[PDB]
Structure formats: C-alpha cells, structure tokens
Design a protein around this ligand. Structure first.
Ligand SMILES: OC[C@H]1O[C@@H](O[C@H]2[C@H](O)[C@@H](O)[C@H](O)O[C@@H]2CO)[C@H](O)[C@@H](O)[C@H]1O
Ligand SMILES: OC[C@H]1O[C@@H](O[C@H]2[C@H](O)[C@@H](O)[C@H](O)O[C@@H]2CO)[C@H](O)[C@@H](O)[C@H]1O
Ligand SMILES: OC[C@H]1O[C@@H](O[C@H]2[C@H](O)[C@@H](O)[C@H](O)O[C@@H]2CO)[C@H](O)[C@@H](O)[C@H]1O
Ligand SMILES: OC[C@H]1O[C@@H](O[C@H]2[C@H](O)[C@@H](O)[C@H](O)O[C@@H]2CO)[C@H](O)[C@@H](O)[C@H]1O
Ligand SMILES: OC[C@H]1O[C@@H](O[C@H]2[C@H](O)[C@@H](O)[C@H](O)O[C@@H]2CO)[C@H](O)[C@@H](O)[C@H]1O
Lengths: 103, 41, 185, 103, 103, 103, 103
C-alpha cells in the first residue's frame, strides 16, 4: 500500500502536496444545513476544508471524513505542527485528502 | 490609590489565565475520547 | 533550563500541580485569589524559601546558582530538591523588566507568573546534607513536544506587568512609559 | 465552499455573527427527554444553545449537532477562547449554527 | 428553550437541584449485564447514577445517556468543578438529568 | 440500584473485587480476527482482560464493553490510579466487569 | 485467554513481534477513496500500516480497526513509547495486528 503521504497523494488526480510545517491558526466548524464542514487556516494565508459528504464520496470515506474532522479539532487544540497535507486542488478552498505530522 | 494597583493585578491575572488555558489544552486533551458518531446516531 | 532549590518534594509538587507561590495551593485554583506584582515579588525575601511571594516563583539561570541560593536558606535540611525547568512565556527575566530598579541585580532571577505547572518541570536533583546527588530524576509528565521550542517571555511583554507603585518615576520614563497601566504613569 | 464563518453565516436566513473573543463561562448539558441539549453562556451575558434535534434539521445535520456538543465541551474545559459564533436569532436562546476559534 | 439548569429542571416532575460546587470524588463504571451504568460520589457523601437505558427513556435520550457518561468520565479525570446537578429523586442513587459547570 | 462497585460486584455469580490502588503497568490491544480484546497488567503481576464480544453478552452490554476499552486506554496513557476492579474469575485472564477510580 | 501480546501473536500465520520501545516518529492519516488508512514510522526506519477494511476483515474486526487507528493517533500526540507490535508481514508496509505499551 503507499508508504508515504507523497506516494499516496500521487495515486490520485487533482491532488497537490503542501508542506506546512506549522500549527493550525484557526478552526471553524459548521453544523448549518448542507454546510457540515470544518475549515482550517494557517498563518501563511492558506485555507483548507474537510468537505461535506456528497456524491463524490464512496461509503468507506464517510467514516474517514469523521476521523479527519476529529484529528483536525485535536491537532488545533494541542497546537501540534502539521508537516504535510495532500489536498484536491480542484476545490475552493482546497480539500484535505491526507495529513502527516512528525516530530 | 488603588486603580494603578488594581490594573496591575487585573492585567497580571489576564496573562496568567491565558497561559493556564495553554496548559489545559495540553494536559486535558489527553483525556478527550473520540466518538463514533455514525453508530451513536 | 532554569533551576530552583526547594524544600517541597516531588510528591507534594505533583499534588499541587507545580511549584506554587506562597499561599496558592493548587495551580488551577481560582477561588483563593492571588495578588500578583513583580516589583513586590522581587523585593521580598522569605525564610526557608527562595522568593515565591506575590504570585511569582523565582529561578536561577544555573544549577550552581540555584544550589548557592538553596544553601543560604536551606543548609541544615537533611534533604531538599533542585528542580530543572523548561523556559516558556510565563517566565520573566526580573532584571530585564525592572531594569535599573531591579532590587537584587546580582542574582539574575527569572520568575514564573503564577507558579510553574508540573508539566514544565523537566526533572530534579536530590540534595542530601547540602551535597547534590548528581543523578537527574526525569519527570515522566514533562511535555517534551510542547516545551521543546518555547522560551522566556521578552521583556517588552512584562513592562506593563512591572507592578511599580503609581508614583514611581519609572512610569514616567522609557521603557515603562509606553506601557503604563491606566492609573500609573 | 465558504472560506470564513462570516461568509458561511450569510448564506442562511435569520443568522448573525457575534464576536465573542472569550472563553465559555458556563456549560449546561441535559439528557432530559425532549430537552437533550447543551446551553453555554459568556461573561458578557449572552446565552446560546445547541438545539434539540428536530424537524427543522435535515439528516446530514444530525451528525453535525453531535460533533458541536463535543467541541463545546472540550473548549469549555480547556478554557479556549471562542472568536465568533454564527447563530440563528429566530430562537431563544439563540442557536449555534457554526463556531470559530483562533490561536 | 430553558436558559439555565434550574429552569430546565423545573419542567420535569420528581426532580430537584443540588448545588454541588465541587469536583467528583470517585467514578465507577460498569459493563456488568443489566448494570451498564456509571456512579459518581462527592466528598459531601452524595452519590448519583446515570441509569441503565430502559423503557423510561425515549429514543432521543439514548444518544444523550452516552454523551452524559462521556462528560462525567472527563469531568472526573480533569478534576473539573461541577456547579449544579438536576436529578430525578424517585430513584436511588438519584439519577442525573442535567449537569452545569461554571468557570 | 447499586451504590458502590462492591455492592454491584456482589450481585453476580463468579465475581471478586481486586483492590488495585495503582496505575496500569502495560496495555495490550488487539484487532486480530476472533481476539479483538484489551489486556492490562499491574506491577503486582495481575493481568485482566476485557473479553471479546460474544454470546455471553446481551445486546445492551456491547456499547459498555466499547466504553470500558475507551476508559482503560485513557487511564493507561495518563497514569490514572485505578482503585478497585470487579472481575469474573471464571476466565483466564479474569474479565473486567466494572472499574472504580478515586480522588 | 492470551495473557500477553506474544502469545496472542503466535496464534496467527504470518505474524511477527517487533520490539519497538520508542515513541512514534510520524503519523499519516488518509481519507482518500480506497486509501482510508493510517501509516506510522519510527526513528529506526520501520513503517507499519493499519489497513483499509476489506474482504480479509470479519465483522468483529471493523470496530477494532477503528479503535487501533484511534490508539495510534493519541499515542503519537502524547509521545507514549510503544513496547511491541504484532504484525502481519505478508503486507507492505507490515500490517498491525496488535500493540503493547508499558509504564
Ligand atoms: O473523494 C472525494 C474527492 O472526489 C473527487 O471527485 C470524484 C471522485 O473521486 C470519483 O471517484 C468520482 O467518480 O467522481 C467524482 C466527481 O466529483 C473530487 O474531484 C475531489 O475534489 C474530492 O471531492
Ligand atoms: O437547521 C436548524 C435551523 O433550522 C431553521 O429552519 C430552516 C430549516 O433549516 C430548513 O430545512 C427549512 O426548510 O427552512 C427553515 C427556515 O425557513 C430554523 O428556523 C433555525 O432556527 C434552526 O433551527
Ligand atoms: O427519562 C428518564 C426518567 O424517566 C422518568 O419516568 C417518566 C418518563 O420520563 C416519562 O417519559 C414517562 O411518560 O413517565 C415516566 C414516569 O411514569 C423517571 O420517573 C425518572 O426517574 C427517570 O428514569
Ligand atoms: O457478561 C459477561 C460475563 O458473562 C458470563 O456469562 C453469563 C451471561 O452473562 C449471562 O447472561 C447468562 O445468563 O449466564 C452466563 C453464565 O454465567 C460469564 O460467566 C462471565 O465470565 C462473563 O463472560
Ligand atoms: O484480518 C486481517 C488479516 O487477514 C488475513 O487474511 C486471512 C483472512 O482474514 C481469513 O478469512 C482467511 O481464512 O485467511 C487469511 C490468511 O490468514 C491477511 O492475510 C492479513 O495480512 C491481514 O490482512
């Protein structure tokens, strides 16, 4: 299976690696209808989203979306640095596919 | 008078309550247990 | 790393949630209200304790300086401890915020606003009959990734916390002038 | 998708932005039947609720209501400052649609 | 909706408010069959339980009983002070309907 | 209902109270087929398990089994002192039925 | 009935015990379709995965795979040392069957 965030990312269309190497500056969570999402931003100006479960998502991803929204809330609260993100850049804001952190 | 004194106390308590929140974000986060929302609902 | 000699032991510190200032019992207790004033902290002295009053706890820049302070106030204590502490922005270099008004210049103390939480204490040495046992005991709960990269608060951030009395000329002069609480200066 | 809570708030009727920039003063959680909800208040005096799941909530919101109660409980306990809240102001107390936190 | 725990407590019969203002002294959690409940005690001597799910519970209280057990376990571990408790007193130990904490 | 772990432990055939008053020395968690269990050990040498779900478990016990495995991971990681354990002694290792923690 | 991870591991074909005794150096989590997994590495060069759920996983394992990914996230965040891993070596990277941590 992929051994790295970068191998994994490269198995997909419309993705791009961001090297962040920093903590989440802000965290936004919405429970508004049809907008049940998390939006995070970094000091450098980038904004990324975990997107709403739609039709572009297979069933196995429904749980993985929830897990990612959990990871993003706890790495914001503990101020853990994110190393890299693999994002779908055909979305605005770009959509998170995988996350890496290391110390 | 007190206002000088009361302002150093108020400002020093603010900077402390703020650092204390940083420490609680570290040590209390260890107890956070994530929920399987889909089977919960 | 900063250093503080203290008669209060590892287990009492765990219970308190850190090295507390005088009269504060638990690190997060908001009930018993605590007066915090750096000038007042800095001038006072205590018996059987390295300065720890008015909401700040002092530390030394070296193990040797901490041991010299502990012997002066804790000599005939069959055992006492020297705690090893990570730098973090609750710490203020007292000479740098009080400046030419720093009361015990030659000591070069760094004080922690509100105490030192247990997770910021890296470890400790036991001192038996005034002689330090060279083995450091590491605190299992030390938050290494958090504290790894933090440092002392810059003096800029403490001038408005100096606690000089309202009529003290320091409030009428640089740097403190640009930072005076409303009611001082 | 929206990039900010202000942007996201304005795409709904009856909402408004409150700039709180403060920790939660008190947290109330109830498992009493028909009032399974959370109520939070601030020093400033406002009170907000996460509403009881109801008919005004489409199904995708049910997992978002649960996550919000989880976020407000760990924010309350660590005393993290809330920055802004998007709330439906056609409810008493007003209901949380979305929350943001910074730093 | 209610704005405070006293106000909400008053809507039910057989309830009463306890002003605890203290952290939990002990926490007991059981998965023994027919006894899947949580019990907490205070140094005042008071004991309270979260009841085993049962017929007196409508379906919306079932996700709320699980949320409440999560709250008491983490309030216990963090030594957080509880302000008030709304309890049904026609049960021994009395059972928790609502909890509030103030910082 | 029971008011203490002893009182609850006494309601079952084949149980016993272990007074631990200590933190967990090791935690083992398994997702291997047919042995999805947790095993804990103390400095005393005593070893306890949370059993694999099976027919000895009524449907209401299954969420409580999952919650107990959640509590044991939290307790191990934060070195929380466990006070007593109520175990079924007809299993090797002995199975946990209930756990209590104090102070 | 297994009392330790080594006994547990020996009941399966194509497993191996690794004595790690180090904390996790990096954590990667993916929600990309058919790549919903967690990859972890250690300073010694070792890389392991928790697999995408699939045909080889029985029903009892579904929940247990979600719990393993939850344990690895929090062990990484709290910098806890892992003692041993029992892995299926017929997968690249080797696949976690069970984890052990002590003290
Ligand atoms: O899985 C989220 C991801 O989906 C992409 O959209 C694809 C999807 O991956 C593919 O399997 C399906 O056949 O068509 C979808 C068209 O929307 C998105 O492009 C990407 O942005 C993510 O949303
Ligand atoms: O979603 C919670 C929110 O609902 C509002 O009602 C909306 C509802 O979301 C939508 O499905 C319906 O079609 O239109 C309603 C407004 O016209 C409530 O008014 C609001 O207070 C919240 O409860
Ligand atoms: O909901 C828990 C609560 O139930 C009370 O019983 C009520 C119940 O809430 C209500 O829906 C039903 O119509 O009448 C019951 C009383 O006859 C219990 O009284 C209380 O102790 C809790 O167990
Ligand atoms: O609940 C786990 C527990 O089950 C016991 O088995 C019981 C079972 O729980 C009960 O429903 C049935 O009526 O009697 C069984 C025989 O005692 C096991 O004995 C115990 O070791 C645990 O596995
Ligand atoms: O359960 C994860 C584990 O599965 C192995 O495959 C098993 C399969 O579960 C079982 O149905 C069959 O009878 O035997 C297979 C071989 O032991 C995989 O081999 C292993 O790598 C894991 O993926």
């Amino acid at each position: 299976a992929p051994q790295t965030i970068t191998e994994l990312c490269s198995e997909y269309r419309n993705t791009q690696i961001y090297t962040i190497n920093d903590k989440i500056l802000s965290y936004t969570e919405s429970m508004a209808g049809k907008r049940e999402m998390v939006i995070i931003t970094f000091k450098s100006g980038e904004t990324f989203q975990v997107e709403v479960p739609g039709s572009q998502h297979i069933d196995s991803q429904k749980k993985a979306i929830e897990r990612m929204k959990d990871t993003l809330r706890i790495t914001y609260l503990t101020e853990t640095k994110i190393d890299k993100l693999c994002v779908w850049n055909n979305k605005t804001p770009n959509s998170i596919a995988a996350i890496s952190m290391k110390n | 008078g007190d206002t000088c004194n009361e302002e150093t106390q108020n400002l020093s308590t603010i900077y402390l309550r703020e650092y204390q929140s940083k420490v609680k974000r570290q040590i209390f986060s260890d107890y956070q247990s994530e929920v399987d929302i889909y089977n919960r609902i | 790393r900063l250093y503080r000699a203290d008669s209060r032991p590892p287990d009492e510190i765990k219970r308190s949630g850190g090295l507390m200032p005088r009269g504060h019992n638990e690190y997060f207790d908001r009930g018993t209200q605590m007066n915090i004033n750096l000038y007042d902290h800095a001038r006072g002295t205590q018996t059987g304790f390295v300065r720890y009053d008015d909401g700040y706890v002092s530390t030394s820049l070296s193990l040797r300086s901490a041991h010299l302070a502990g012997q002066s106030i804790l000599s005939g204590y069959s055992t006492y401890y020297i705690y090893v502490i990570a730098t973090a922005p609750n710490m203020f270099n007292v000479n740098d915020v009080l400046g030419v008004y720093s009361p015990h210049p030659y000591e070069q103390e760094v004080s922690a606003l509100g105490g030192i939480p247990y997770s910021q204490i890296y470890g400790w040495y036991r001192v038996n009959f005034g002689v330090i046992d060279e083995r450091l005991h590491r605190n299992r709960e030390y938050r290494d990734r958090y504290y790894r990269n933090l440092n002392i608060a810059p003096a800029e951030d403490g001038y408005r916390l100096a606690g000089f009395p309202p009529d003290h000329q320091a409030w009428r002069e640089e740097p403190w002038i640009h930072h005076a609480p409303q009611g001082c200066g």
